Write a protein that binds this ligand. Structure first.
Ligand SMILES: [Mg+2]
Ligand SMILES: [Zn+2]
Lengths: 180, 225, 149, 374, 193, 116, 99, 109, 540
């Protein structure tokens, strides 16, 4: 629930397995690494510096998430990965409802673009904030889920107004003060 | 000096289970809720305890293997040592040992401790012995807060860590009742405290109050730049 | 989160008048079955009446379910979940709080015995066996429709 | 005196005791007791609703609402104290029970004496079978009691016969009715002449008697009724209802029970067992119908104590409703309660374990019968 | 039909609304046509339910403000047998110099844990319906309809109980296939061969 | 059977076997148990008798007779109710013990250890 | 499809001259209305009137006491059903033996 | 290690600065939690169930008294010991002669 | 399938339509998959393998056997006035059709002979109501129509058949935990399940236990001494630890067929696949918007849902094999030339065996078998499921102080979403929760047979409410049973300490831990218009 519409929660092991190439390039680039073997040993050592460089790399690099069954046309979307601890990918409730979420564990494939053209296309076209209307007729595919609808209904429902709030007829005999 | 608090009830269900009830009657309208919620959040997760952190056996291949003469395996012995309740007041690391020989049942009375740490239950079951075999086990005690995950395994070889839980208070509960003063709204506050025997509910109450005061003190210091 | 809606056993409410409808339906079914043995009616009529005297009864119940909820217990958790469109459907709610009604196998084959009990009261063994038919039909048509689509 | 009238259950205290033991035609395996439950689904005719000791009757009477006091003698062993405890925990007044540190409860010493035949003799009797009337009968309980319940087991011992007679005399002097539930033991099924000359003194001093169908036939005539229930019409069906070939629920005419009536008799019950309850009064007759649905729980399906619940319900309704003596509809509406109690008492292994309460029996009476019945 | 037929719906369905309607018809809060509440009355009570609860809570608050806190909370403290009137409290304060709060704490010091957990229903955050707090066991059992016909003792099982498989509801022990076939002569041993 | 073990250990004897075992000599106590397949209380007595036979593997002789095939012999033994046990001492001068009802196993142990 | 039900308890009063005798599919006796009729429910306080002119099958008689929520007439779904007639053969099984 | 940083936001109506509100709230909390530290100045049958589970019936009593105690929901000896003499007096048809006889019977053992 | 003792007993009861000389998957018509009236009491109507092979894989019923002609038969009870009057007959599916079979109680009396009363019966594959004089046979067993999986579901009359199938499928995917606990509310078949599982040491002889040890048990009978081994931390076929514990002290008598030693996922001779946890049904900050569970942190440090898993494949010794007691990590090699532990696998090497001789008819030291033990604590992403079809994925772990707490002062362990209850149509879970709470307060366990409404209408309601009120009156906890809303109680918030405006369901259910934790994509990418991304994906 805390994630935004564009951010996604990426586990630590999946994140490092995906951005190993970029983090090795970052290690060999600036300092603290002289060869590929030393960089691999430092990455396997689980040092804080490799996690810091991983975060700096994945700060603004778009990632693509696609469900295994691609039934709908919006099954493949792009997100911005956020380093999270655990063994499960965290997604937004609205996108999950729009991606045909199931009770069972739905497997999610994670792909990372490499070329500049792929990154520009993923950042400018495949984001979720650019595709909110279904191509069938034009209805919003991202609508509030069950819990959100229940909350809104409890908010805008009100309360009793007649015999259920007063016992006797009010014809025989004040409300809250006038809130400015 | 109008607010008065007194221990209404005090019982000892077992040597490792204490119960105490309190009252704070002349309390005011909105103070009762705040006091109750803060004392509850302080009694559950702000008091600290001492528990066995690391155990070193004599000669075992792994923690899941069995040992002759003892019914329980090494894993069950570690789980039994995890439930041992101790009492201390000084931070750091202390060492203890069990060195019982012969047939019988090894209990808490068999643990020898430094002059700072003491035992409470003194009757807990660690393991059972059936043959005249020396049982020699090393122990390590530490005072901390929360629960510890046995992630590090360095600085020692041949010792199995156990995930201790430094939580003296078992459960807590508070109730608020009206005083019936007409115009002015006054409320009565009750408090229930269940402790594991390491400290009485009154001491836990005092310690939670002191911890809350220590948490609220730094806002009155000089602003740092 | 602040409201913490929840569904309970007693929270499931049935239309005030159910003991009357089911009772008159089963009374009419008895009178028919007596007369059948006397020669006053024929099997096709018995078959037909049974299905109908039951379908009409069930629908009165389903249609009446919504007025009861809105008039008597407006803020009923099951009513909140159904009317808001969050979870459930009128058909699902009816099975929980009213009666499951008559159900048949694929391409006819009526069970000839109605389901007078909902999930709260508890289905009988025969009613459970009958509902297994529709359950199997659903779980097979799901796969068939997916493979075709 | 409290509002519910107190009743006295005189006799012996035994954990699980089936006195009616006869010969059964169909039999099951010798060792496999896992298949002995099949004979509790289709039982022999004489064990369809077996009785038991009066302790079970008192327990069922207290559970169904009411006050019961057990009058007997037990030893100072663990078994006697356990039984007293059981009774006390279920609120059965046990002021009457006496403790003697001379004999052991349930133990009876006998001498074999194998001399041209197995002929045993009783040297020492159990305390349950040895109760004196010199200082043991508690006068007070007797004074505050309205129904005196006793079985035919006390007549099989020459030491409690005089005690039972003294108790009946005192109960009738203080103004209390006498209940006689036979439950004929094994020695009483030898011949009808001996059993009729042995249970004649207590029969003439009983106001309410609850016989069994097999017991009533054994007393009047066995082969006659066995032949009547197999009439086998060959040409036509005369009664117009014998064509269905159903069971024979024969209602004995009031002239057939004439050799068993006397002046002091108020009511009689044939008690086929959870199916039919033929009641006979000096002014009217009748019969009530039962259900017998023990097959709804095959895995428990225990009818060890079923007549005790019926007797307890009858005693409760008699102590509460005084109009059951001069009215026929009230009698049926009150006997349906005992029928429901006996039906509920067959769904639990153990007699004391599965005795129902008043609310459960009333619920069963309201669920089985139609509203016009109750 | 001439004969009244049997049905599973002949008996009325027990509900909480009927029990509450009877409880409030007693003591003279509402008036019902007849001694038993009908279905329309229960349906009407289902809509107008919070009004009477608020009225009872207001009555309890008025009684608390009228009789005093000690005399009010003495209902859940039965081990304290002393005069609870306001005049008695004033006299005790004039004699021994003990304020009302001291006397209240002293009377609570003689309270059991069961009594405290029963008193916990008068909380300002969660005030329970005063009618349900003082309901008898005879009225509460009518909610579900009394004791069940089938005894519950058949379902009760001791937690620390080891199942005995030599019971009337378990099959015979399954013998080893090798030994079972060797006893009947289907398989011959190695020596005998 | 020598490869498989018998599930049940209490053997069923006739009315003549009992008389032959009584008129002879013995060095172990004898326990006679009357039962009938029809009685309910009996199912519970068979398990207790089997446990008592397992506890005394050779220090006692536990046998059972049936009342549907030996009804006359049961009546001659002054047997009144269905669950009836006879504890007969090895010395032919001490009297037997008739115990009617579902007695606990501890009472049976006490009787065997003290009375017999 | 649509079943006219009784609004309240009372007596059903209608003129039987305009209605013509018939037999329901379910075998019960009935009345068929080919014209508009107005039935009255003589209740404790008020009255009620309802009926459908093209096809009404009236299942009740004149001066008949009826309770609430009871089926009185059938609109008969006068609108024509889709004409997909399927003819099915049900078999009657003898319960007992004989000639 | 898992450190946490708190971010407090305060909106005042102008009567006092947001910085003084923190000090006022902290002092009020300290004053509310101090009272928990205030300290005032100082100035056969001999087993368990062999007597406990003894129901009143076994201990011989006159009938009157037995019946009365029963209507008073007094069954065992612990219920009799818990009830005092004053409430015992409250019991209907219970008299002083009875209280002395029940005390004697409880002491005659 | 040696995952749990349930898969060992439900695997042999399977029936397969496909195979040699059988109907294929797609070739089989739609008429074969649906249920037939002849399948009553012989084939389970609930158990069905989901997927393309739907309706072709079924489970055999409990009371079923082969009838000497390859035909499966079911028991029935005669209720006709015959010489015997009672005989459990096994009826072939063709012979049973000609008899009147009725499943109904005889608790009805309407001023008649009790034989003129109606009862639902089955005749000629058709349901009809007939008098009690015409019925010939009668089905009296409760578990006669269901299999092992469908029977282990308590209160099955209040759930749909789809959720019954889902629960029967999820019960197979259960992990035997370290310490097992029996369920408070059960069906009564777990005893025979643990008996026929095979993981329980049953006595093959009668005698006293003269020597008790962790490795073996010695039973002395009539002079002969029988030695019985014990499984101590063995590996199953699907990476599950197997262990046996003793349950009989030294010096007690035993009979043939009684338990001498316990087993994995079994305690006291009953199947134990989960633990009892305090559960509340309410929305909580959207963490359970979908099917998801917000659990407490107590389940992590109290060793509640901890399980063991054993997988086979500086620390290297002189020969090269990893020594015992070594703690391997992802990337460490033990023996390409040297076998390395894959990603996600780390644990203690319990034992190593050198397969110098293969048994494949040659001595093949292709490799040496090594075993590692991984104690997997309950974490985020794990799937927890109940016995009624409720499934949830763990979303967040919160401390004890942040969880909602009852009026007694105890923090709830799990929080479930309430909106799933009307969606999946499960009502029995509420009964189970309430009765489990009542039993935990009363220190009782309940074993209920299915279809208890045959005794009386609304039997389960009475059974639950009576126990709730008894627990509320014996122990002074009025919040357990509140008359205004029976089965619901008011709880508080853990952060602010304020009560929610609506009561919630409180109970202790039995929660199980689960083992499981193209062209369309190209069409979608072409629809979006990302040609370069599609080219890169195809080249990769
Ligand atoms: Mg899925
Ligand atoms: Zn149910």
């Amino acid at each position: 629930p805390s994630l935004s519409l564009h951010r996604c929660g990426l586990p630590r092991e999946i994140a490092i397995e995906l951005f190993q190439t970029f983090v090795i390039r970052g290690l060999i680039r600036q300092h603290l690494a002289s060869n590929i073997g030393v960089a691999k040993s430092k990455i396997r050592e689980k040092e804080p510096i490799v996690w810091e460089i991983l975060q700096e790399v994945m700060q603004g690099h778009p990632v693509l998430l696609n469900r295994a069954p691609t039934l709908h046309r919006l099954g493949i979307q792009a997100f911005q990965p956020v380093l999270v601890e655990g063994r499960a990918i965290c997604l937004h409730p609205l996108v999950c409802k729009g991606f045909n979420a199931d009770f069972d564990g739905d497997q999610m494939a994670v792909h990372v673009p490499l070329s500049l053209e792929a990154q520009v296309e993923a950042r400018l076209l495949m984001f979720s904030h650019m595709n909110l209307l279904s191509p069938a007729i034009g209805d919003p595919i991202s609508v509030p889920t069950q819990d959100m609808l229940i909350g809104l209904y409890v908010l805008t429902s009100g309360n009793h107004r007649g015999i259920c709030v007063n016992r006797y007829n009010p014809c025989n005999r004040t409300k809250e003060p006038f809130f400015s | 000096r109008t607010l008065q608090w007194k221990c209404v009830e005090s019982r000892t269900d077992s040597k490792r289970l204490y119960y105490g009830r309190f009252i704070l009657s002349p309390l005011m309208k909105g103070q009762a809720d705040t006091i109750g919620i803060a004392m509850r959040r302080a009694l559950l997760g702000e008091i600290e305890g001492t528990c066995i952190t690391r155990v070193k056996s004599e000669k075992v291949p792994h923690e899941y293997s069995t040992i002759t003469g003892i019914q329980e395996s090494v894993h069950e012995i570690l789980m039994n040592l995890k439930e041992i309740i101790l009492r201390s007041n000084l931070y750091g690391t202390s060492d203890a040992s069990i060195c019982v020989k012969g047939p019988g049942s090894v209990t808490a009375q068999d643990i020898i401790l430094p002059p700072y740490v003491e035992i409470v239950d003194n009757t807990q079951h660690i393991a059972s012995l059936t043959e005249p075999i020396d049982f020699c086990i090393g122990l390590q005690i530490e005072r901390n807060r929360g629960y510890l995950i046995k992630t590090p395994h360095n600085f020692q070889d041949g010792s199995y860590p156990i995930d201790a839980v430094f939580m003296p208070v078992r459960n807590a509960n508070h109730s608020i009742h009206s005083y019936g003063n007409g115009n002015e709204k006054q409320e009565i506050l009750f408090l229930e405290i269940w402790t594991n025997g390491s400290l009485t509910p009154k001491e836990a109450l005092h310690e939670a109050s002191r911890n809350l005061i220590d948490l609220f003190i730094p806002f009155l210091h000089m602003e740092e730049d | 989160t602040a409201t913490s809606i929840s569904l309970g056993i007693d929270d499931l409410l049935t239309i005030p008048s159910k003991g009357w409808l089911v009772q008159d339906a089963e009374q009419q079914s008895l009178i028919l079955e007596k007369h059948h043995h006397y020669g006053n009616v024929h099997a096709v009529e018995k078959l037909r009446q049974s299905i109908e005297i039951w379908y009409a009864t069930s629908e009165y119940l389903r249609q009446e379910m919504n007025p009861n909820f809105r008039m008597t217990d407006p803020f009923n958790p099951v009513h909140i979940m159904s009317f808001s469109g969050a979870r459930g459907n009128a058909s699902q709610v009816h099975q929980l709080v009213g009666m499951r009604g008559l159900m048949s196998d694929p391409q006819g084959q009526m069970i000839d015995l109605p389901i007078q009990s909902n999930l709260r009261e508890g289905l009988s063994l025969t009613e459970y066996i009958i509902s297994c038919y529709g359950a199997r039909k659903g779980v097979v048509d799901t796969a068939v429709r997916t493979s075709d689509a | 005196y409290p509002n519910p009238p107190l009743v006295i259950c005189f006799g012996a205290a035994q954990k699980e005791f089936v006195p009616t033991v006869r010969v059964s035609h169909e039999q099951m395996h010798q060792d496999k007791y896992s298949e002995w439950k099949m004979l509790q689904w289709n039982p022999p005719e004489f064990v369809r609703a077996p009785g038991g000791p009066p302790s079970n009757v008192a327990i069922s009477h207290v559970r169904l609402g009411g006050r019961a006091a057990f009058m007997g003698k037990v030893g100072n062993d663990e078994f006697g104290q356990e039984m007293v405890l059981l009774m006390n925990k279920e609120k059965v007044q046990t002021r009457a029970v006496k403790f003697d540190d001379s004999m052991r409860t349930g133990c009876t010493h006998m001498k074999i004496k194998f001399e041209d035949g197995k002929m045993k003799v009783e040297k020492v009797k159990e305390p349950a079978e040895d109760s004196l009337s010199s200082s043991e009968l508690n006068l007070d309980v007797l004074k505050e009691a309205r129904i005196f319940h006793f079985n035919s087991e006390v007549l099989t011992s020459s030491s409690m016969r005089s005690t039972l007679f003294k108790a009946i005399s005192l109960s009738k002097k203080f103004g209390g009715l006498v209940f006689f539930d036979l439950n004929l033991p094994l020695p009483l099924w030898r011949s009808r002449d001996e059993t009729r000359n042995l249970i004649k003194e207590a029969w003439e001093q009983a106001n309410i008697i609850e016989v069994s169908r097999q017991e009533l036939e054994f007393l009047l005539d066995e082969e006659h009724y066995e032949r009547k229930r197999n009439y086998r019409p060959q040409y036509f069906a005369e009664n117009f209802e014998q064509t269905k070939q159903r069971r024979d629920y024969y209602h004995y005419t009031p002239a057939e029970i004439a050799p068993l009536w006397h002046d002091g008799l108020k009511l009689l019950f044939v008690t086929d067992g959870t199916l039919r309850l033929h009641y006979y009064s000096p002014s009217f007759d009748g019969v009530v119908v039962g259900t017998e649905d023990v097959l709804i729980t095959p895995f428990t399906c225990d009818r060890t104590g079923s007549g005790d619940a019926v007797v307890a319900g009858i005693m409760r309704k008699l102590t509460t409703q005084p109009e059951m003596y001069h009215d026929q509809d009230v009698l049926e509406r009150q006997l349906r309660f005992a029928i429901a109690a006996g039906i509920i008492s067959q769904w639990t292994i153990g007699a004391v374990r599965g005795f129902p309460t008043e609310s459960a029996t009333q619920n069963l009476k309201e669920q089985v019968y139609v509203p016009s019945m109750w | 039909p001439e004969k009244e037929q049997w049905s599973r719906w002949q008996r009325r369905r027990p509900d909480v609304e009927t029990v509450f309607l009877k409880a409030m018809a007693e003591t003279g809060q509402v008036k019902l046509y007849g001694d038993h509440p009908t279905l329309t009355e229960t349906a009407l009570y289902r809509a107008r339910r919070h009004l009477y609860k608020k009225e009872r809570l207001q009555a309890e608050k008025e009684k608390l403000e009228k009789i005093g806190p000690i005399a009010y909370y003495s209902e859940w403290v039965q081990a304290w047998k002393k005069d609870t009137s306001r005049e008695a409290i004033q006299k005790h304060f004039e004699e021994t110099g003990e304020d009302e709060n001291t006397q209240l704490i002293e009377m609570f010091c003689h309270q059991t844990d069961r009594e405290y957990r029963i008193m916990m229903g008068t909380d300002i955050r969660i005030p329970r319906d005063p009618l349900a707090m003082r309901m008898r066991e005879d009225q509460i059992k009518q909610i579900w309809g009394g004791d069940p016909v089938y005894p519950t003792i058949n379902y009760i099982q001791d937690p620390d109980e080891v199942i005995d498989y030599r019971g009337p509801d378990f099959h015979e022990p399954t013998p080893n296939m090798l030994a079972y076939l060797k006893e009947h002569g289907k398989i011959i041993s190695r020596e005998e061969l | 059977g020598k490869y498989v073990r018998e599930d049940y250990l209490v053997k069923k004897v006739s009315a003549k076997d009992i008389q032959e075992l009584i008129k002879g000599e013995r060095n172990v106590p004898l326990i006679i148990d009357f039962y009938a397949t029809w009685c309910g209380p009996c199912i519970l007595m068979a398990q207790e008798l089997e446990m008592l036979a397992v506890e005394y593997e050779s220090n006692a002789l536990i046998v059972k007779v049936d009342t549907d095939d030996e009804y006359e012999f049961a009546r001659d033994m002054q047997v009144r109710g269905l669950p009836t046990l006879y504890f007969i001492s090895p010395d032919p001068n001490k009297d037997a013990i008739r115990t009617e009802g579902l007695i606990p196993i501890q009472m049976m142990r006490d009787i065997i250890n003290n009375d017999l | 499809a649509e079943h006219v039900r009784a609004p309240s308890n009372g007596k059903i009063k209608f003129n039987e001259d305009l209605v013509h005798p018939t037999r329901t599919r379910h075998g019960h006796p009935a009345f068929l209305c080919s014209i508009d009729l107005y039935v009255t429910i003589e209740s404790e306080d008020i009255l009620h009137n309802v009926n459908i002119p093209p096809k009404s099958l009236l299942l009740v008689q004149n001066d008949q006491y009826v309770e609430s929520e009871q089926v009185i007439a059938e609109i008969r779904a006068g609108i024509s059903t889709l004409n997909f007639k399927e003819k099915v053969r049900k078999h009657i099984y003898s319960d007992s033996d004989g000639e | 290690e898992k450190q946490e940083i708190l971010f407090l936001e305060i909106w005042t109506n102008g009567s006092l600065t947001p910085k003084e509100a923190l000090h006022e709230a902290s002092r009020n909390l300290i004053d509310l939690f101090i009272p928990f530290l205030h300290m005032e100045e100082d100035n056969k049958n001999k087993k368990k169930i062999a007597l406990k589970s003894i129901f009143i019936d076994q201990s011989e009593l006159p009938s009157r008294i037995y019946n009365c105690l029963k209507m008073s929901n007094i069954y065992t000896l612990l219920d009799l010991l818990n009830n005092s003499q004053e409430d015992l007096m409250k019991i209907e048809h219970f008299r002083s002669e009875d209280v002395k006889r029940i005390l004697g019977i409880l002491e005659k053992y | 399938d040696r995952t749990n003792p349930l898969t060992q007993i439900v695997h042999g009861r399977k029936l397969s339509y496909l195979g040699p000389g059988g109907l294929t998957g797609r070739t089989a018509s739609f008429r074969i998959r649906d249920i037939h009236p002849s399948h009553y009491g012989r084939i389970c109507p609930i158990d069905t393998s989901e997927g393309i092979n739907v309706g072709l894989i079924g489970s055999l019923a409990i009371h079923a056997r082969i009838g000497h002609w390859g035909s499966l038969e079911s028991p029935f009870y005669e209720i006709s006035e015959r010489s015997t009057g009672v005989r459990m007959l096994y009826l072939s599916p063709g012979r049973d059709e000609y008899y009147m079979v009725a499943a109904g109680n005889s608790l009805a009396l309407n001023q008649d002979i009790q034989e003129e009363q109606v009862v639902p019966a089955r005749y000629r594959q058709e349901f009809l109501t007939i008098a009690w004089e015409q019925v010939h046979l009668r089905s009296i067993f409760p578990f006669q129509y269901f299999s092992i999986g469908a029977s282990l579901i308590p209160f099955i009359e209040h759930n749909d058949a789809n959720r019954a199938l889902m629960s029967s499928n999820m019960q197979r995917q259960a992990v035997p935990l370290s310490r097992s606990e029996k369920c408070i509310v059960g069906t009564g078949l777990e005893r025979q399940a643990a008996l026929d599982s095979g993981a329980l040491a049953i006595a093959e002889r009668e005698g006293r236990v003269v020597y008790t040890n962790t490795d073996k048990i010695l039973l002395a009978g009539n002079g002969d001494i029988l030695s019985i081994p014990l499984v101590i931390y063995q590996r199953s076929n699907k990476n599950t630890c197997m262990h046996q514990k003793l349950q009989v002290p030294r010096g007690k008598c035993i009979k043939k067929g009684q338990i001498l030693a316990d087993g994995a996922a079994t305690v006291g001779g009953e199947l134990a696949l989960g633990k009892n946890v305090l559960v509340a049904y309410m929305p909580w900050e959207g963490y359970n918007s979908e099917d998801a569970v917000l659990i407490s942190e107590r389940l992590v440090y109290e060793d509640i849902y901890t399980s063991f898993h054993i997988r086979k494949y500086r620390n290297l010794d002189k020969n090269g094999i990893v020594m015992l007691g070594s703690w391997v990590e992802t990337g460490d090699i033990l023996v390409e030339t040297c076998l390395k532990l894959p990603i996600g696998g780390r644990g203690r090497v319990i034992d190593v065996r050198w397969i110098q001789k293969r048994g494949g008819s040659s001595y093949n030291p292709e490799t040496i078998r090594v075993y590692i033990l991984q104690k997997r604590e309950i974490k985020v992403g794990d799937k927890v499921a109940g016995r009624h079809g409720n499934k949830g994925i763990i979303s967040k772990i919160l401390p004890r102080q942040d969880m909602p707490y009852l009026q007694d002062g105890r923090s709830v362990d799990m929080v479930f979403n309430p909106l799933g209850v009307p969606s999946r149509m499960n009502v029995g879970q509420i009964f189970e929760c309430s009765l489990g709470l009542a039993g935990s307060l009363l220190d009782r366990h309940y074993r209920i047979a299915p279809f208890d409404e045959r005794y009386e209408q609304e039997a389960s309601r009475k059974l639950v409410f009576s126990e709730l009120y008894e627990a509320s009156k014996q122990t002074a906890n009025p919040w357990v049973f509140e008359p205004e809303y029976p089965g619901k109680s008011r709880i508080f918030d853990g952060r602010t300490g304020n009560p929610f405006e609506q009561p919630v369901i409180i109970g202790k259910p039995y929660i199980l831990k689960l083992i499981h934790q193209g062209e369309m994509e190209v069409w979608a990418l072409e629809g979006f218009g990302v040609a370069h991304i599609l080219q890169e994906m195809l080249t990769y």
